[PDB]
Design a binder for this molecule. Structure first.
Ligand SMILES: CNc1ncc2cc(-c3ccc(-c4nc(C)ccc4F)cc3Cl)c(=O)n(C[C@H]3OC[C@H](N)CO3)c2n1
Length: 264
């Protein structure tokens, strides 16, 4: 952290880009470089019991050096408020980019491939993301895809063994749910009360992708969504999955999807 410097001098705080984990988040300008940053501001008086989780995510983010994990720039204490500075990703979240209409399987495969590259990095570093979902996948204005909002060490994306109380294979399950979310717009059971979903996920057979989607994509989903974690493939293996190989294209193509969300 940094208790000496004054973040309100070092950064110009602009519009809020939504609420987030434990505080409000703002677009802002690093006044020395004029690069755009995301600023999360947490009132530490208003969040006693959550502070340890806050630090835990600070530690994990600071240990990540990858093109597929949102860059962390540091944190500052000003009076009661903790400022946390990350890079700003101007394309928005994958969830946002679902609004104008359905994604095609090229777009789905491209986003899934970049997520897999992030999970391969994290898992190779003996880390677990713990909250893979479309709302936690951020795109740069050039279409690069990055992971954010790590979960702490809502049920729809949770693996059954997480609910019952796991390793990196829990991220593979969440990726399967996220694949359904990117194809269909929402995860399985999204109409139901969360406490019903809490017993549905361990009780029921795994969700399947339903609709007129290609068979490789349905098999990609099925491969992720096996109740037995050891039967789930690794992220390295899924990077070679035929759905990915036959459908993913350059990430720069995803700028069309970002422009669409701007015209909507
Ligand atoms: C739209 N472009 C965009 N670019 C970047 C960000 C970065 C964050 C973010 C994330 C986490 C933390 C953080 N937190 C803790 C508790 C500890 C350490 C930490 F570093 C800090 C920040 Cl600055 C951010 O909220 N957002 C908005 C966010 O998106 C994902 C959605 N699920 C919610 O809204 C962003 N948005």
């Amino acid at each position: 952290t940094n208790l000496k410097a004054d973040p309100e001098e070092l950064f110009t705080k602009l519009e809020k880009i939504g609420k987030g984990s434990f505080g409000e988040v703002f677009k802002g300008i690093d006044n020395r470089t004029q690069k755009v940053v995301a600023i999360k501001i947490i009132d530490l008086e208003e969040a006693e019991d959550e502070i340890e989780d806050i630090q835990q995510e600070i530690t994990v983010l600071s240990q990540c050096d990858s093109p597929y994990v949102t860059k962390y720039y540091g944190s500052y204490l000003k009076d009661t408020k903790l400022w946390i500075i990350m890079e700003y990703l101007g394309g928005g979240s994958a969830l946002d980019l679902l609004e104008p209409g359905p994604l095609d399987e090229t777009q789905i495969a491209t986003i899934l491939r970049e997520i897999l590259k992030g999970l391969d990095y994290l898992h190779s570093e003996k880390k677990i993301h713990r909250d893979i979902k479309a709302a936690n996948v951020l795109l740069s204005e050039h279409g690069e895809v990055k992971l954010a909002d790590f979960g702490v060490a809502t049920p729809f994306w949770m693996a059954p063994e997480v609910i019952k109380q796991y390793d990196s294979k829990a991220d593979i399950w969440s990726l399967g749910i996220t694949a359904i979310e990117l194809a269909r717009g929402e995860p399985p059971h999204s109409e139901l009360h969360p406490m019903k979903v809490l017993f549905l996920i361990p009780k029921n057979n795994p969700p399947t992708l339903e609709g007129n989607y290609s068979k490789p994509l349905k098999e990609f989903v099925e491969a992720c969504l096996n109740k037995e974690p050891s039967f789930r493939p690794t992220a390295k293996e899924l990077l070679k999955h035929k759905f990915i190989l036959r459908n993913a294209k350059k990430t720069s193509y995803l700028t069309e999807l970002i422009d669409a969300h701007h015209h909507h």
